[PDB]
Amino acid sequence: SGAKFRISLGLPVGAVINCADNTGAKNLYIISVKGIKGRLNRLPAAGVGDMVMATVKKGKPELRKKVHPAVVIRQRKSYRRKDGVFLYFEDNAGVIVNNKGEMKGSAITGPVAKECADLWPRIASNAGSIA
Amino acid sequence: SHRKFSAPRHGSLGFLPRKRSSRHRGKVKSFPKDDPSKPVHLTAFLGYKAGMTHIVREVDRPGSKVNKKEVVEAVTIVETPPMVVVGIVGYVETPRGLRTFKTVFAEHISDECKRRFYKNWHKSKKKAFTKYCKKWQDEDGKKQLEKDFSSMKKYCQVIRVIAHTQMRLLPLRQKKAHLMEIQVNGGTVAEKLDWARERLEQQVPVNQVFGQDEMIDVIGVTKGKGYKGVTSRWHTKKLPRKTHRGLRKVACIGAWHPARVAFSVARAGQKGYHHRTEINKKIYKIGQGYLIKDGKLIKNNASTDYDLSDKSINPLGGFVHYGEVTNDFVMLKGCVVGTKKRVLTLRKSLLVQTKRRALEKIDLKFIDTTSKFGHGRFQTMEEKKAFMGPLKKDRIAKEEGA
RNA sequence: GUUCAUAGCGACGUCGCUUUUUGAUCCUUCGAUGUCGGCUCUUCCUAUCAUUGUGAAGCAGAAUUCACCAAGCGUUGGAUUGUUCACCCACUAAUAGGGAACGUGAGCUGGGUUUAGACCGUCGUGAGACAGGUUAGUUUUACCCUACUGAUGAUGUGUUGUUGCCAUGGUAAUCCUGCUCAGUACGAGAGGAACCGCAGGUUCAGACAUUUGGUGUAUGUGCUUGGCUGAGGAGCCAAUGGGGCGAAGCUACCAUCUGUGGGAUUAUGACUGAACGCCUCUAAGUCAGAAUCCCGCCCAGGCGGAACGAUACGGCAGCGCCGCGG
RNA sequence: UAAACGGCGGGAGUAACUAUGACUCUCUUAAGGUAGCCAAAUGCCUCGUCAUCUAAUUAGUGACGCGCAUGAAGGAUGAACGAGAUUCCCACUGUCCCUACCUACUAUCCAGCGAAACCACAGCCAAGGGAACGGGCUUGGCGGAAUCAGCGGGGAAAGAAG
RNA sequence: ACUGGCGCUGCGGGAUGAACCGAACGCCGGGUUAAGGCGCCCGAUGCCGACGCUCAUCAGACCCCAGAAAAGGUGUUGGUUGAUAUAGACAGCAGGACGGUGGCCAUGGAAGUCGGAAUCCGCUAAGGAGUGUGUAACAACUCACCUGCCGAAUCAACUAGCCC
RNA sequence: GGGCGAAGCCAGAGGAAACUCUGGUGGAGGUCCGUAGCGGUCCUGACGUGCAAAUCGGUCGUCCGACCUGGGUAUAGGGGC
Ligand SMILES: [Mg+2]
Ligand SMILES: [Mg+2]
Ligand SMILES: [Mg+2]
Ligand SMILES: [Mg+2]
Ligand SMILES: [Mg+2]
Ligand SMILES: [Mg+2]
Ligand SMILES: [Mg+2]
Ligand SMILES: [Mg+2]
Ligand SMILES: [Mg+2]
Ligand SMILES: [Mg+2]
Ligand SMILES: [Mg+2]
Ligand SMILES: [Mg+2]
Ligand SMILES: [Mg+2]
Ligand SMILES: [Mg+2]
Ligand SMILES: [Mg+2]
Ligand SMILES: [Mg+2]
Ligand SMILES: [Mg+2]
Ligand SMILES: [Mg+2]
Ligand SMILES: [Mg+2]
Ligand SMILES: [Mg+2]
Ligand SMILES: [Mg+2]
Ligand SMILES: [Mg+2]
Ligand SMILES: [Mg+2]
Ligand SMILES: [Mg+2]
Ligand SMILES: [Mg+2]
Ligand SMILES: [Mg+2]
Ligand SMILES: [Mg+2]
Ligand SMILES: [Mg+2]
Ligand SMILES: [Mg+2]
Ligand SMILES: [Mg+2]
Ligand SMILES: [Mg+2]
Ligand SMILES: [Mg+2]
Ligand SMILES: [Mg+2]
Ligand SMILES: [Mg+2]
Ligand SMILES: [Mg+2]
Ligand SMILES: [Mg+2]
Ligand SMILES: [Mg+2]
Ligand SMILES: [Mg+2]
Ligand SMILES: [Mg+2]
Ligand SMILES: [Mg+2]
Ligand SMILES: [Mg+2]
Ligand SMILES: [Mg+2]
Ligand SMILES: [Mg+2]
Ligand SMILES: [Mg+2]
Ligand SMILES: [Mg+2]
Ligand SMILES: [Mg+2]
Ligand SMILES: [Mg+2]
Ligand SMILES: [Mg+2]
Ligand SMILES: [Mg+2]
Ligand SMILES: [Mg+2]
């Protein structure tokens, strides 16, 4: 199999990231990260490939006042990729998925991190490019 | 009342005398358990932290994401010139612990070794071991030496050899060699005494002690940081900005009772220069050192099976704050305690290595030799001169060079 | 509790424990023990939420419930509120309960209560009052002793050095996920495990700077504003003039590396075997047995030892051994 | 005589779906709270109920009103203004995650100079008993000169006849 | 309320302690005691002390006094009452445990056992028209009741000592 | 030192008039930003055996007016103001 290696997170709770799918949502406001046990005073943070709980602050009104599962696909924080490559993206972006992992939308604008694409095959299918 | 939210403790109480180490060398404190079935071998060595670099290799870890893939891994270079054996110590087991039974020193103790016995070598008369070495010649002294060896053979349980490093082969200012007792394991006491007695006055290279892609323990003293406060020493939480008398402090150092400050409360003081022992450090490479058969050979230090570049382990412009590495070296994986040119003790592992992280064959593809004195971007001098072409100083030199 | 008192509960009664509630009392303190909460930080308790090992079920599996050994380790991020409490959001293995002068103000803060200003409601003829609401309201001192943290030293071995031993003290690792087992056992079906193995992560710890990031007065090198040296060139002042890039060093789960073995046993399940010609884990005698315990590994090293080295002049100058020499 | 101080209540019946009571009886009063406004800096119950704002709001706003205990020289509005009280949004950021590095002046060491507060005696703990929280006492643990830089657990530390 | 004490009071003992127990006090020597003690701290049992009880993986250990109850134990030790037994106990190993009757009223099966009443008789070695398991119900087991092998004591209910 | 730009006035245009619109001029105000001055919001900053028995740093309020200020006068204790 093979599990995801540790990467720099750079997206704590309360970060607003772009919404890269065609669901009509324009941004995603991260309220928590899946799988975070915790630590006193430590904000739960997410990197690319992490499932998060997010609410959309602007977008279509039927998506706004709800909690959506989402997966981070791009991040502005540089992270090491086990071959000495420190890679970062131009913006923080994520797509809205369900608990099973498939997207609510059908297309992704921009690249998807290879770390996210390998870990979520339903996201990888809709990815225009994998970076 | 109980604290409102649970939080784990800051720092470990297993290193509590957070004080300057009483030694600079770093002592073993536990040699690998001896079993007579093994062949006679040495269990430790002394090296010097030259510097760090990184390598490229292919991983052979099945079931992993990085299986058959290239990785970049930081390594530490430890220069290890051969040790010189100058003595033998015998220990006897007592109900009060091991006690030193008899020590026998070789004739012709090296000049750098004898410097260890003097606080002021410059004013000394250099008289150490001068009367002792005379007993290796007369028959009366030689008989006494044989009784010392026979007594060690019939009474001692573990024996150790005194070995010292060779300062004259290092680019350091220090000329005082580092002495060390290295335990001899793997045989009967008679066999390890015969083995050690042949090695007297001899040189033991590092490849006779350690091997390729085996995991060893590194013992040494960490970098000193001076007097430090609780925020840097114990990594406690910084107090808010509004705090009156200071925020880099621990707010409560104990309850009203037990009416004392406990030993477990974080308090300011010395940080760094602590004796530490790190286990499970894999040997990626044992470098071969500089030779002269017809010309000087440096390829055997950084060329791999896939590089074939005539370059040594030394970075472009030399190791920063160390010098040039010309002797044998051990390429350890990861970081190692201490500053540059800090003496390190390498010890055989006390554990049995059976996991797949251990016993894994290491095959290097690339060794980085860019300049570490800045953002170096060239592996070798020749690559740099080929890229940039002739320069102005080369022209004015070639003008004088006709 | 479909039957069935006791899997799990327990009416009527009745025996206790605890001092994390509120009372009762008024023994100490009124020539003053700073009075709530939060923050920070350590330690302790167990009446155990999770995790290890187990016994029981109305335990098919999954899930759950009851109990035992057990406090090693963990028990979180937020909206509202001064709150303690409360409630909701979300994550989680779990989001257990408590003590330490209702721990902790020469540690902080000062939101609350609890001075003086002021407004409202009610009460009062009034001054004024209100465990009613609201707004603004000085948080002083350590250099002493001890404690603790580090730092020199001290006793003794003739002096001095090197290499060592280990009494004793500390102690550390933790938890989760995915793959496989396996759509397997089990189950009518729906569903649905586990041991070995592999790959990784969380929290913690100890480091380290090859790489990435941060710093940057190398006041290093360009750019630039105002002024000044007659101009150029070279510079300087503007409490670091400003700004770009920046070596070295320091430094970040914001980069990287590493984190371990036994022993006696607890609960429990058993062996042989009486007592009690049967039975029986127990009485004698045995076995297996764990996040506990002790030790190892690791940190320190005793008014505790060891082995070994060298041990004082080119001049009268000191010293050692031999003589039981006086 | 109330732009004087001030005050401005309860039980019964009653509208052709029901429900309330516009409307009438009496007790009582000097009149029995009109116009307005409100869980307001005024509402105990109360974190009132509904809507909105949020993922979540004892906060905010809008609305309701048998209002413990709103209300007319003060009531209700309404621009501009405010080092006044409050809530939200954009932007911004070391407030924070989560801390790091640098600079100046200190602290530090030295030459010179040189106080004060405070002081029964003093100064290592556990338990006991005791004016019911001991530095001294009892029983145990133990105890090694002289000191330096810090530190804020204790001295129920100091400051003031609470 | 009564007497005594502390306050006003030292001393011996209770480790420690205003009040408990002994005893009240000029400065001393010898003898002897009180209450309390006699492994060692710490004077005195260093007696060839007596008879028992008790094992605790939270034992127990002396007025006040400084920690425990109800309720339990097939731990062990005494004691009380009753019962069986060479017409052979007890425990083990092995059989019958029926007929009317799958008794009546409950019924949808309740047949001995989801329930209401009564307890018949014969075979005898015994059998309850049933102490329980259980079968949809049958059925199949077991018990109380007797018999065989076994050949000397055993069983039951209480009670109170130490221990748990 | 700047900003806003009241009345009064000039020119042009449109109007039957009433008058209106546009561009200038003008320079009002217990007007605004902001020095000196005067004051003293917040940091609940520094200090807190201080520089100081009330000070200091930054940030602030006002800054043509109910403005700031010297000197001379008057009011004196149950009195003044
Ligand atoms: Mg917090
Ligand atoms: Mg807790
Ligand atoms: Mg403050
Ligand atoms: Mg470098
Ligand atoms: Mg029942
Ligand atoms: Mg009193
Ligand atoms: Mg005080
Ligand atoms: Mg105090
Ligand atoms: Mg328990
Ligand atoms: Mg308190
Ligand atoms: Mg305090
Ligand atoms: Mg204070
Ligand atoms: Mg306040
Ligand atoms: Mg007030
Ligand atoms: Mg009134
Ligand atoms: Mg104020
Ligand atoms: Mg000082
Ligand atoms: Mg130990
Ligand atoms: Mg621990
Ligand atoms: Mg210029
Ligand atoms: Mg020029
Ligand atoms: Mg000048
Ligand atoms: Mg100037
Ligand atoms: Mg830069
Ligand atoms: Mg890290
Ligand atoms: Mg048997
Ligand atoms: Mg057992
Ligand atoms: Mg065993
Ligand atoms: Mg009138
Ligand atoms: Mg009204
Ligand atoms: Mg109201
Ligand atoms: Mg209000
Ligand atoms: Mg809010
Ligand atoms: Mg409202
Ligand atoms: Mg209305
Ligand atoms: Mg004490
Ligand atoms: Mg008084
Ligand atoms: Mg007074
Ligand atoms: Mg008196
Ligand atoms: Mg008297
Ligand atoms: Mg008396
Ligand atoms: Mg006495
Ligand atoms: Mg007593
Ligand atoms: Mg006498
Ligand atoms: Mg005694
Ligand atoms: Mg005696
Ligand atoms: Mg003005
Ligand atoms: Mg103004
Ligand atoms: Mg003020
Ligand atoms: Mg202040």
From Swiss-Prot, chain A:
Keyword Phosphoprotein: yes
Quaternary structure note: Component of the large ribosomal subunit.
GO molecular function: large ribosomal subunit rRNA binding; RNA binding; structural constituent of ribosome; transcription coactivator binding; ubiquitin ligase inhibitor activity; ubiquitin protein ligase binding
Major place of residence: cytoplasm
Keyword annotations of the record: Cytoplasm, Phosphoprotein, Ribonucleoprotein, Ribosomal protein
SUPFAM superfamilies: Ribosomal protein L14
GO BP: cellular response to actinomycin D; cytoplasmic translation; G1 to G0 transition; negative regulation of transcription by RNA polymerase II; negative regulation of ubiquitin protein ligase activity; negative regulation of ubiquitin-dependent protein catabolic process; positive regulation of cell population proliferation; positive regulation of gene expression
Name assigned to this protein: Large ribosomal subunit protein uL14
Species of the source: Homo sapiens (Human)
Similarity annotation: Belongs to the universal ribosomal protein uL14 family.
Modified residues (Phosphoserine): 8
The protein's role, per its UniProt record: Component of the large ribosomal subunit. The ribosome is a large ribonucleoprotein complex responsible for the synthesis of proteins in the cell.
Pfam families: Ribosomal_L14 (PF00238)
GO cellular component terms attached to this protein's record: cytoplasm; cytosol; cytosolic large ribosomal subunit; cytosolic ribosome; extracellular exosome; focal adhesion; membrane; nucleolus
Positions of modified residues (Phosphotyrosine): 29
Swiss-Prot record, chain B:
Compositional bias (Basic residues): 17-30
Residues carrying Phosphoserine: 12, 303
Record's keyword annotation contains Plastid: no
Cross-link Glycyl lysine isopeptide (Lys-Gly) (interchain with G-Cter in SUMO2) placement: 38, 223, 225, 285, 365, 385, 392, 398
Residue numbers spanned by region Disordered: 1-36
Subcellular location: Nucleus, Nucleolus; Cytoplasm
Main location (coarse class): nucleus
GO molecular function terms listed in the Swiss-Prot or TrEMBL record: RNA binding; structural constituent of ribosome
Cited InterPro entries: L3_arc_euk (IPR045077), Ribosomal_L3_dom_3_arc_sf (IPR044892), Ribosomal_uL3 (IPR000597), Ribosomal_uL3_CS (IPR019926), Transl_B-barrel_sf (IPR009000)
Sorted UniProt keywords: Acetylation, Cytoplasm, Isopeptide bond, Methylation, Nucleus, Phosphoprotein, Ribonucleoprotein, Ribosomal protein, Ubl conjugation
PTM annotation (N6-acetyllysine): residues: 135, 285, 293, 365, 372
Pfam families: Ribosomal_L3
Keyword Nucleus recorded: yes
Tele-methylhistidine sites (modified residues): 244
Record location of the Glycyl lysine isopeptide (Lys-Gly) (interchain with G-Cter in SUMO1) cross-link: 293
An example Gene Ontology biological process: cellular response to interleukin-4
Family: Belongs to the universal ribosomal protein uL3 family.
PANTHER family: 60S RIBOSOMAL PROTEIN L3-RELATED, LARGE RIBOSOMAL SUBUNIT PROTEIN UL3
Subunit structure comment from the entry: Component of the large ribosomal subunit. Interacts with DHX33.
Protein's UniProt name: Large ribosomal subunit protein uL3
Species per Swiss-Prot/TrEMBL record: Homo sapiens
